[PDB]
Amino acid sequence: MKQWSENVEEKLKEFVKRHQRITQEELHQYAQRLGLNEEAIRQFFEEFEQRK
């Protein structure tokens, strides 16, 4: 169930959607800064809110 840092997942929503949006390239750098991994990064994109 832990595929990232709990509070990081939260604040990615803060930084991506709740802000003026951030590019995936910069996002990935910021991801590994807070403690993400490509697993959580894919999760966050594919299952953001465009889920199908």
3-state SS, one letter per residue, for 29-46: HHHHHHCCCHHHHHHHHH
Experimental technique, in short, is NMR
Q: How many beta carbons lie within 10 A of that of residue 44, not counting itself?
A: 19
41: domain range?
1-52
Alpha-carbon torsion angle 4, 28, 30, 45, nearest 10 = -60
E strand or H helix that includes residue 1: none
- What percentage of the chain's residues is helix, strand, coil (to nearest 5)? 60, 0, 40
Provide the number of structural domains found in the chain: 1
CATH number where 29 lies: 1.10.287.210
